[PDB]
């Protein structure tokens, strides 16, 4: 059953990035007030707000370091700033004045997957989330030239909009890799504990298969309902480690009680989705599927 993978908005007809006034963002957030904050500390603070036109936005205010360039601002502007797809967060505008660098996303109703999955998601709903987030990443790797390597896929960087559909976000660490290359050399260790592929700890090189590892983790989170690290059941392990040792024993215990409880006849489909996740988490990068294959695994499971 023949599927055309990418058929999202044609850029040429898209609303261009609006350059915004700092004063407007300043006012709309009440002087960047604390009760407007929705995200704190990581490379900036993110504030919920409604613009002059009624549009609900999230405004990321990037922290300016003395004697430094705006690398993270540019990373988003040169990547998510240039593309649109239903499984990517919409970057609506930006503010660049003096040393201020702000990024204005369309506001995604339910905030991040992490926020939701821990503090209502049924299977059908979670299935849709894994699929859409796979499509978003696939777009970055396969439908962009040069390719985009996200470098920080995690459940907090998967937003959920009105109809609970997945939107990959936070492009601050993203990098462009020529299609002729297989990897990009980076200067430092970047990524979130729980999600870093093994090879990133051996060599300062990122690649699309790097992103694919991190995706696998996000999929575990959906299947298990666990955080990627620091859960009491884990012990000396992470989510990845835990699922690994745990499975020789009783595989289906790994699954989230809430999904199992909803229906005992989805225990098989759940198991099949775990195969995808495990493939993505292969220690050998070359053996991991591309995100295009992951999507194909998903749609095979259904039929």
């Amino acid at each position: 059953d023949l599927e055309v993978l990418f058929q999202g908005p044609h850029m040429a007809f898209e609303k261009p990035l609006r350059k915004l006034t700092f004063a407007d963002l300043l006012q709309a957030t009440n002087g960047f007030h604390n009760d407007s904050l929705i995200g704190s500390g990581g490379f900036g603070d993110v504030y919920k707000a409604i613009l002059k036109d009624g549009s609900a936005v999230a405004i990321k205010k990037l922290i300016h370091v003395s004697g430094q360039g705006d690398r993270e601002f540019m990373a988003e502007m040169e990547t998510i700033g240039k593309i649109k797809h239903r499984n990517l967060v919409p970057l609506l505008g930006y503010c660049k004045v003096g040393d201020e660098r702000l990024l204005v996303y369309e506001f995604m109703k339910y905030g991040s997957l992490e926020d939701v999955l821990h503090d209502k998601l049924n299977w059908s709903t979670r299935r849709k989330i894994a699929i859409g987030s796979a499509r978003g990443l696939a777009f970055l790797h396969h439908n962009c030239s040069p390719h985009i390597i996200h470098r920080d896929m995690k459940s907090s960087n998967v937003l959920l909009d009105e109809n609970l559909e997945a939107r990959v976000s936070d492009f601050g660490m993203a990098r462009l890799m020529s299609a002729m290359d297989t990897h990009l050399s980076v200067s430092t260790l970047a990524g979130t504990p729980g999600y870093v592929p093994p090879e990133y700890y051996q060599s300062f090189r990122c690649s699309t298969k790097g992103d694919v590892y991190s995706y696998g983790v996000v999929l575990l989170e959906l299947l298990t309902g666990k955080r990627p690290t620091d859960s009491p059941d884990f012990g000396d392990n992470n989510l990845v480690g835990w699922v690994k040792q745990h499975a020789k024993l009783r595989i289906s215990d790994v699954f989230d009680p809430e999904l199992m409880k909803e229906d005992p006849a989805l225990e098989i489909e759940l198991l099949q989705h775990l195969k995808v996740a495990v493939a993505c988490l292969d220690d050998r990068a070359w053996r991991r599927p591309t995100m295009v294959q992951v999507m194909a695994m998903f749609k095979e499971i259904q039929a």
Partner: peptide, 16 residues
Amino acid sequence: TMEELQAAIQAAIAHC
């Protein structure tokens, strides 16, 4: 390890 795990999961669907 991983492929052992993959086998385990295949048993599980079969062992349903």
